[PDB]
Write a protein that binds this ligand. Structure first.
Ligand SMILES: CCCCCCCCCCCCCCCCCC(=O)OC[C@H](COP(=O)([O-])OCC[N+](C)(C)C)OC(=O)CCCCCCCCCCCCCCCCC
Ligand SMILES: CCCCCCCCCCCCCCCCCC(=O)OC[C@H](COP(=O)([O-])OCC[N+](C)(C)C)OC(=O)CCCCCCCCCCCCCCCCC
Ligand SMILES: CCCCCCCCCCCCCCCCCC(=O)OC[C@H](COP(=O)([O-])OCC[N+](C)(C)C)OC(=O)CCCCCCCCCCCCCCCCC
Ligand SMILES: CCCCCCCCCCCCCCCCCC(=O)OC[C@H](COP(=O)([O-])OCC[N+](C)(C)C)OC(=O)CCCCCCCCCCCCCCCCC
Ligand SMILES: CCCCCCCCCCCCCCCCCCCC(=O)O[C@H](COC(=O)CCCCCCCCCCCCCC)COP(=O)(O)OCCN
Ligand SMILES: CCCCCCCCCCCCCCCCCCCC(=O)O[C@H](COC(=O)CCCCCCCCCCCCCC)COP(=O)(O)OCCN
Ligand SMILES: CCCCCCCCCCCCCCCCCCCC(=O)O[C@H](COC(=O)CCCCCCCCCCCCCC)COP(=O)(O)OCCN
Ligand SMILES: CCCCCCCCCCCCCCCCCCCC(=O)O[C@H](COC(=O)CCCCCCCCCCCCCC)COP(=O)(O)OCCN
Ligand SMILES: CCCCCCCCCCCCCCCCCCCC(=O)O[C@H](COC(=O)CCCCCCCCCCCCCC)COP(=O)(O)OCCN
Ligand SMILES: CCCCCCCCCCCCCCCCCC(=O)OC[C@@H](O)COP(=O)(O)OCC[N+](C)(C)C
Ligand SMILES: COP(=O)(O)OP(=O)(O)OCC[C@H](C)CC/C=C(/C)CC/C=C(\C)CC/C=C(\C)CCC=C(C)C
Ligand SMILES: CC(C)CCC[C@@H](C)[C@H]1CC[C@H]2[C@@H]3CC=C4C[C@@H](O)CC[C@]4(C)[C@H]3CC[C@]12C
Ligand SMILES: CC(C)CCC[C@@H](C)[C@H]1CC[C@H]2[C@@H]3CC=C4C[C@@H](O)CC[C@]4(C)[C@H]3CC[C@]12C
Ligand SMILES: CC(C)CCC[C@@H](C)[C@H]1CC[C@H]2[C@@H]3CC=C4C[C@@H](O)CC[C@]4(C)[C@H]3CC[C@]12C
Ligand SMILES: *[C@@H]1O[C@H](CO)[C@@H](O)[C@H](O)[C@H]1NC(C)=O
Lengths: 203, 86, 150, 80, 422, 150, 150, 150
């Protein structure tokens, strides 16, 4: 757990620093320097929107790959003695890959909402552009993380179903239902993302 | 210079591919096709008076392509001679 | 007018409502499914009944979706900071309550499914416990609604 | 360079219709008549759909190609 | 299951049998696969040059087929490729066709008819001068002025898009629409084949509940999308570009009932009413499948004559309806894989060309003619290592996957046994 | 004449009250859940009797919900920074007290249901201990109310 | 006049006095309940006598509650920043001292109940240790009061 | 006009596209390699057949390289913040997609090489999975081509 120790140390140090910094800012009457408005406003909307698109695609692909290998290891381990699995259980893999597809689609649906400003002053950038950036980032986060969790869940269920299939053929048909449920979450994320960027308009 | 027939087959197929595709590329360059404009090694000065300089550069690249086609013809001949040897 | 950055917290509220509820539902479904698949080899006739926990986990996702939709429909580029904070709170509440309920449903469903594989009489008991976990997510939804509509 | 949308559409529609409609009746009778007819009809349908999509995507453009100034300068002289 | 396979159809029969041998006397996907698998591969592997190479390789395998059949070896990969020599031949031919349609040949167009885009009208009718050319790095072109756009290119994509930096902007839309259109049409054909299955097996219950709800749902929801795509292609032009709606937003609004009073206008008069009617029919198709068939089965097999278990029948029908309804959406989404793989192949070929043989072509001195030798070999081997073999394999397997899942799920059951004679 | 971001903290009260409590409850409903399953194989007749821990864990969630709803009904656009801090304090108090009570209830309930399968007399003992754990959450609620109704 | 952020530290003092004391009491109760469940398998008659740890853990929570309520009663709109610091210090002192005391009570009570199953004479000794592990919380309470009532 | 730091993000995108993809490929080329070394002791004839995973891992790297080059050739001195962050998004997309696809390819190939050693029929099966994993990276690349040329 050496790497876990490093991560825990970094996390604890960062958050102890944050606690002490917040205490110092609040107590020394220097709260006006902790402009969260300035951070959210000066930071370009392009950063938020492009991070949103990149996450929408990359986290979806990460979940798809996670599920694909989680279920493919089990498929190819079980198929050594029951090769029929390789034929029937590809559906599990399909579901995992489906996740990634949603990703790209949402990426497109988000990438179509981008447009330059020709402005730098926050009053000039405006509520419309700032909300467009924030909502593209939020939709990217929603789709990417929902797809990540859905892909991992479908992969776990598919590995379970492949291990069950290796011992009784008549079980996969009844375990796929779980995968279907596990797939729905992905769709939900997409829907929410589509609702978040429905009225988004940069320019 | 005897060699394995597999290598001779690969050499002759590559020679045929090179000859055909590089002859076609030379013909298309010599026709001054705009699709290949990005491959022409022109400079800023070439945009001074007219397109004749770019035409000359197209012809030069076509000559390079034909030279490559001839070299691949020689390579294919060598491979065919080796095949006849085997 | 209102601040330029006001919509940020509402956006994050919707994102949290969906993301954390999806995390909870995904964990519940994964744990329940990996318990159900492993049971089925021993007790193949129980799968359908044992699908009940998965459904419960799925419901958690729905809750998130519901609240997310609300926050994604009541969120304009010029909402007051107060409404944006309300939507952020509703989203965090529903998302993290759904996360906790999904973890509880996964654990309880896996354990109860295996026990039912070993003890049919446990089935009803499992359902009760699952409901007690499922209600947790419902609680979050309630609070989320109260915050998002206000 | 006026590419009228009458000769292409008429020519390709009639060609692929003759291949996909008239072709089956000219296939000699034999064990493979059914599979050959299916091949004819499917090729006609798929190829005609692909060509129709390709041509319609270009009909009524909502924006023109973005050409570097070097290639614009060359194309002015070269192309019609 | 016995199919009386032939030498040519053996490859495709083995291809369609890999996912499960068809039941006794059900609609065989082999005859339709024989064409739609090479075609769905060519849509992804669309390239005139790579298609030519594949066709020549497959023709070599076919002509020398007897020799290799006699001279048997243990190479699994070569044996697999050889067994699909006819599959590869058809894939190469269809890839040649699509590469002609894409106007692509080793990442380069052809221009055999002449481009429809003339730059001179920009100088004549437009405001352009040599000053504007000097001042603008990339500029652009507009068809609004009269003589710039002289109609659509008669056959395939216009060559100018190869040299236009706006290439991807147009090609992404064109290929996304093409992928969705082909996918929806393939799925509709599958559903019609399912109707044929039901008619032959004498299952009117499936025909009236099942196939008909399925086709109504698919056509109303997604066939309408193809109609919208074609209509927008035919209707909106450069002059009406400003207010041209986005069919993505319109489809989303149709699903959400979010027809707004602001933003892009309606594609046609009465869009609200027609789209509401289509959506209502689509939702009603769900109860049509779910509630009806279980009730009729229960009525005619447990009230008449008096094991039937209503709860499990209802659950099974609910699972089937959920599967089909989510499958329509997820399959129309998955068919974008065609555009994804086509764009990836095109971009990989473009970068390979511009990174390998642009070195040998972009040399002033005549000595470059020697360099083009070595460079070209690398190009050649790369075009045979990354594009022909690996990208070709990926496109092949993804056309396979589209046939197994997206297409055959509509009508194929695959719960039979291969007929293994003595 | 108050900051427009004052409500933020108050919201983070409500949210927290419903989130942390839920998490705590979940843990309870999780651990006890597993315990019941583990002990249901050999002693089925104790499944319903051994559902007390889950119920207690459920009550913890309710505590949070109550406070959350209370806070969610005390929020206003012009909420002063003082009242917002009061609501944040109440939310944290109830949420984390319920979290600790849920941890204690989960551990005690798992141990007690496992032991009662072997020692019937332990049942009452378990209940007593569970009550004590429950009381912890109650304390939080009390403080929360005192903070949330000033 | 006075800073508006002083009430934040006052409510943090109250919520810390409650939360950390509740966490300590929860840990003590959980460890003691695990020990009691383990012990009672062979020695049922000691299920009640072995509940003293839990009680001694519960007392810790009460300490926190006391301080919390005190702070929740001393809070007002215009507490000087110094008064808010006093309340925060009192809350932290009581909460964390109670947390340490709860850890000690849990460990000592678990060990003592496990040992008393094998050696009755340990009981009295155990009690003493628990007292020595409980006065710690008392000490915190004292300091908190000295800070809270100043 | 534009900030002098606008070119940073795009550059990082390019580097990211090369780095993470390479890492992905590396992991694949490692895991599959290990598997081959484990397989080849008993079934040497399958080395060439079983080298497919590595090749696919290599393909992933190529995708990254492509995007990297596509971004490294488009970085101009006056690169606006819009183009800079478009290239950053493309780089993140391709890099992380290639990383995940390389991990999946490595694990699946390491399993499938050994499986094909045991059961020859699994060979094609392994491939049928690997391509799926591979296209995940491709999907990232696709989005990159959509972004860096928006
Ligand atoms: C160990 C793992 C590796 C590290 C990973 C984590 C990295 C964490 C990142 C740290 C960045 C923190 C932001 C710094 C800016 C804010 C500083 C601040 O609040 O003070 C300035 C603020 C504002 O200052 P000001 O605005 O009056 O100053 C004028 C403005 N400048 C200086 C820019 C011209 O308040 C003060 O003035 C406080 C002065 C005292 C300094 C107190 C700093 C707080 C932390 C001190 C202890 C360290 C904490 C960690 C404990 C040990 C580890 C657990
Ligand atoms: C157990 C841990 C050990 C405790 C110490 C931890 C490390 C903290 C030290 C970090 C280095 C900072 C040293 C001071 C640097 C100079 C700063 C400066 O100029 O100050 C101006 C700041 C800010 O400016 P100002 O307030 O002086 O100016 C007036 C500003 N107006 C008008 C707005 C009010 O104030 C000071 O004068 C601060 C002096 C003392 C700062 C001491 C460090 C702060 C952090 C202490 C730890 C906090 C937790 C305490 C409890 C811990 C218990 C476990
Ligand atoms: C570890 C998990 C997370 C929780 C701990 C860390 C939370 C915060 C981490 C992010 C960095 C720091 C954020 C705060 C920045 C300071 C903002 C500021 O100055 O404005 C304050 C604002 C405004 O300050 P102001 O000076 O503008 O005052 C208002 C004046 N008028 C109205 C005239 C404008 O008010 C507050 O005090 C809000 C409370 C938040 C600030 C305090 C942060 C608390 C940090 C944790 C320690 C809590 C103390 C008790 C410890 C025991 C806990 C149980
Ligand atoms: C110069 C190069 C030009 C490019 C040429 C290469 C193009 C790239 C794409 C080629 C893919 C080839 C695979 C399809 C052909 C096999 C299908 C067929 O008809 O056989 C049925 C095969 C094998 O034939 P079979 O033995 O089952 O035949 C039936 C026999 N009975 C009835 C007795 C059982 O059957 C199946 O298992 C069906 C599923 C096949 C799915 C294909 C999986 C992918 C295979 C990858 C091949 C290797 C990669 C290429 C390596 C090249 C380097 C050497
Ligand atoms: C806990 C006390 C307080 C600590 C406070 C200070 C901050 C934390 C610093 C670490 C303190 C604990 C000591 C840990 C040392 C590093 C981790 C273990 C050793 C190590 O790194 O070696 C291996 C990784 O290789 C490597 O060397 C790779 C590591 C380097 C990677 C750098 C990239 C990360 C940069 C940070 C940003 C990311 C943030 C993510 C949250 C892991 O060893 P093993 O576990 O395999 O073998 C078991 C034994 N080692
Ligand atoms: C016990 C644990 C601790 C709990 C306590 C809460 C801790 C939260 C941490 C965040 C910091 C504390 C929140 C209050 C301080 C906010 C900053 C105030 C400083 C200030 O005056 O800035 C104003 C702008 O900030 C604003 O108005 C910003 C409003 C938004 C503040 C809150 C945002 C925090 C981040 C939340 C992220 C959530 C993510 C969820 C996934 C001025 O602006 P002006 O208009 O006067 O400008 C005039 C320019 N000429
Ligand atoms: C919007 C675009 C999509 C449109 C797609 C649908 C429209 C095209 C298909 C419509 C139906 C065509 C006719 C069906 C067959 C009728 C039977 C007579 C046909 C005929 O003359 O040939 C018989 C052999 O046909 C046979 O053996 C079977 C021929 C089957 C033809 C249809 C197959 C292609 C459909 C797939 C299209 C491509 C995919 C689209 C994405 C000779 O009679 P015989 O003596 O052989 O007796 C029969 C068995 N032996
Ligand atoms: C480049 C642009 C065009 C691209 C798109 C079109 C591509 C068409 C691809 C199909 C053409 C190749 C067909 C295979 C040639 C080899 C023949 C193999 C053996 C053979 O005769 O196969 C028979 C099956 O029918 C057959 O072999 C079928 C032959 C007749 C097919 C008719 C349909 C062709 C496509 C539509 C018309 C052309 C459109 C383009 C102008 C039955 O095997 P056997 O009895 O000989 O076996 C002897 C052992 N039992
Ligand atoms: C096995 C295959 C299964 C089927 C697969 C196909 C998918 C079927 C989808 C559902 C049924 C067909 C589509 C119905 C939705 C409406 C279609 C509108 C098409 C469209 O854009 O046409 C414009 C509207 O037409 C008008 O202005 C006229 C009034 C509005 C349309 C009325 C309904 C037309 C369709 C009739 C039913 C066809 C059924 C096909 C199966 C042309 O109008 P514009 O541009 O000139 O005017 C505009 C200024 N005013
Ligand atoms: C191993 C097996 C063998 C493999 C064989 C592979 C063969 C590949 C050979 C070609 C590769 C290079 C492709 C480049 C294609 C561009 C050439 C091109 O554009 O052609 C046309 C140009 O000449 C004319 O066009 P223009 O002058 O711009 O316009 C004038 C056109 N009007 C007159 C019709 C209006
Ligand atoms: O040309 P352009 O590319 O510039 O834009 P356009 O608008 O003019 O043309 C676009 C034409 C077509 C719409 C382009 C096809 C592109 C697609 C990205 C998505 C296809 C996926 C589908 C239909 C199913 C999955 C869901 C998608 C949004 C979610 C819908 C489902 C629910 C809300 C439940
Ligand atoms: C059984 C249902 C109602 C849910 C279980 C929890 C119930 C009992 C809780 C949840 C929220 C709670 C309410 C929260 C806030 C207030 C405002 C207060 O001034 C009067 C009590 C009242 C109105 C509470 C009554 C009890 C309550 C309704
Ligand atoms: C054993 C019983 C009494 C405790 C269980 C119910 C608890 C939550 C209730 C019962 C009576 C309640 C008190 C009654 C009235 C008030 C006055 C108000 O301004 C602050 C809260 C305060 C001080 C309440 C705190 C919470 C309280 C103690
Ligand atoms: C479980 C029980 C028996 C243990 C003791 C808890 C009760 C009695 C404690 C906890 C909080 C305490 C309160 C804390 C603060 C105040 C305000 C102070 O100015 C006078 C007394 C008063 C009102 C206290 C009375 C006693 C009190 C209510
Ligand atoms: C100037 O430019 C506009 C916009 O492109 C064009 O429509 C118009 O005809 C031009 N007018 C001239 C050259 O007088």
């Amino acid at each position: 757990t050496g790497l876990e120790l490093l991560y825990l140390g970094i996390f604890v140090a960062f958050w102890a620093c944050m606690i002490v910094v917040g205490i110092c800012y609040t107590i020394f009457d220097l709260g006006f320097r902790f402009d969260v408005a300035w951070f959210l406003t000066e930071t370009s909307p392009f950063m938020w929107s492009n991070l949103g698109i990149g996450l929408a695609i990359s986290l979806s692909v990460v979940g798809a790959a996670w599920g694909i290998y989680i279920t493919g290891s089990s498929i190819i381990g079980g198929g050594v003695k029951a090769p029929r699995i390789k034929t029937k259980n590809l559906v599990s893999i399909i579901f995992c890959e489906a996740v990634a597809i949603y990703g790209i689609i949402m990426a497109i649906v988000i990438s179509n909402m981008a447009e330059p400003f020709s402005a730098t002053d926050p009053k000039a950038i405006g509520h419309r552009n700032y909300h467009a950036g924030y909502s593209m980032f939020g939709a990217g986060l929603t789709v990417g993380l929902s797809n990540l969790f859905c892909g991992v869940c479908v992969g776990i269920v598919g590995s379970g179903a492949a291990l069950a299939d290796a011992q009784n053929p008549s079980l996969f048909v009844k375990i796929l239902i779980v995968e279907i449920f596990g797939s729905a979450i992905g769709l939900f994320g997409v829907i929410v993302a589509i609702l978040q960027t429905s009225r988004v308009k940069m320019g | 210079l005897c060699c394995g027939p597999k290598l001779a087959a690969c050499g002759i197929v590559l020679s045929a591919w090179g000859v055909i595709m590089l002859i076609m590329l030379g013909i298309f360059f010599n026709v001054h096709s705009a699709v290949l404009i990005e491959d022409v090694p022109f400079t800023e000065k070439d945009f001074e008076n007219g397109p004749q300089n770019i035409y000359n550069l197209y012809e030069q690249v076509s000559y390079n392509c034909f030279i490559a086609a001839g070299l691949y013809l020689l390579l294919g001949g060598f491979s065919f001679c080796q095949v006849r040897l085997n | 007018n209102n601040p330029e950055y006001s919509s940020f917290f509402g956006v994050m509220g919707a994102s949290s409502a969906m993301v954390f509820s999806a995390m909870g539902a995904a964990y519940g479904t994964a744990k329940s499914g990996t318990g159900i698949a492993a049971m089925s080899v021993m007790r193949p006739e129980l799968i359908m009944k044992s699908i009940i926990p998965v459904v419960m986990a799925g419901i958690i996702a729905i809750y998130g979706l519901v609240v997310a939709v609300l926050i994604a429909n009541s969120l304009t580029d010029g909402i007051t900071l107060y409404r944006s904070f309300l939507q952020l709170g509703a989203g965090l509440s529903v998302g993290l309550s759904g996360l906790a309920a999904g973890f509880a449903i996964g654990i309880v469903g896996d354990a109860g499914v295996r026990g039912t594989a070993q003890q049919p009489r446990l089935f009803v008991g499992m359902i009760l416990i699952l409901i007690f976990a499922e209600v947790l997510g419902l609680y979050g939804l309630i609070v989320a609604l109260i915050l998002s509509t206000k | 360079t006026a590419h009228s949308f009458a000769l292409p559409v008429i020519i390709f529609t009639t060609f692929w219709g003759l291949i996909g409609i008239a072709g089956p009746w000219f296939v000699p009778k034999g064990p493979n008549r059914g599979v050959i007819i299916t091949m004819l009809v499917a090729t006609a349908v798929c190829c005609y759909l692909f060509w129709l999509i390709a041509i319609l995507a270009q009909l009524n453009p909502l924006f023109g190609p973005q050409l570097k100034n070097e290639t614009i300068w060359y194309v002015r002289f070269l192309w019609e | 299951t016995y199919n009386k396979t032939n030498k040519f159809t053996h490859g495709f029969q083995n291809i369609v049998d890999a996912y499960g041998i068809g039941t006794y006397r059900e609609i065989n996907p082999a005859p339709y696969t024989v064409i739609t698998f090479p075609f769905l591969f060519a849509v992804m592997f669309g390239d005139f040059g790579h298609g030519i190479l594949m066709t020549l390789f497959a023709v070599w395998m076919v002509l020398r087929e007897s020799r290799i059949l006699s001279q048997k070896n243990e190479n699994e990969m070569f044996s697999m490729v050889f067994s699909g020599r006819y599959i590869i031949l058809l894939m190469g031919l269809f890839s040649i066709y699509t590469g002609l349609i894409y106007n692509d040949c080793f990442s380069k167009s052809l221009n055999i008819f002449g481009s429809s885009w003339s730059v001179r009208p920009m100088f004549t009718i437009g405001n352009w001068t040599e000053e504007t050319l000097l001042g603008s790095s990339v500029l652009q072109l507009n068809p609004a002025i009269p003589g710039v756009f002289g109609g659509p290119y008669p056959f395939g994509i216009d060559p100018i898009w190869n040299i236009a930096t706006n290439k991807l902007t147009f090609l992404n839309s064109f290929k996304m629409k093409m992928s969705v259109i082909l996918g929806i049409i393939h799925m509709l054909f599958g559903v019609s084949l399912s109707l044929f299955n039901h008619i032959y097996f004498k299952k009117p219950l499936n025909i009236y509940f099942g196939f008909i709800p399925e086709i109504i749902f698919m056509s109303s929801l997604f066939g309408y999308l193809v109609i919208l795509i074609f209509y927008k292609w035919t209707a909106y032009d450069a002059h009406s570009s400003r207010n041209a709606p986005s069919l993505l937003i319109h489809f989303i609004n149709m699903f959400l009932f979010s027809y707004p009073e602001s933003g892009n206008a309606m594609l046609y008069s009465g869009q609200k009413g027609i789209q509401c009617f289509l959506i209502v029919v689509a939702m009603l198709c769900v109860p049509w499948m779910l509630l009806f068939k279980p009730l009729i089965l229960r009525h005619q097999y447990l009230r008449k004559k008096h094991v039937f278990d209503f709860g499990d029948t209802m659950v099974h029908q609910a699972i089937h309806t959920i599967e089909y309804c989510l499958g329509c959406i997820s399959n129309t989404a998955s068919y974008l894989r065609l555009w994804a793989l086509s764009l990836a192949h095109a971009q990989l070929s473009e970068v390979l060309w511009t990174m390998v043989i642009h070195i040998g072509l972009h040399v002033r001195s005549l000595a470059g003619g020697l360099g083009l030798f070595f460079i070209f070999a690398a190009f050649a081997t790369l075009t045979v290592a990354i594009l022909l073999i690996m990208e070709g394999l990926s496109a092949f397997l993804h056309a396979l996957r589209l046939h197994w899942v997206e297409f055959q799920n509509k009508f194929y059951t695959g719960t039979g046994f291969k007929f293994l004679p003595f």
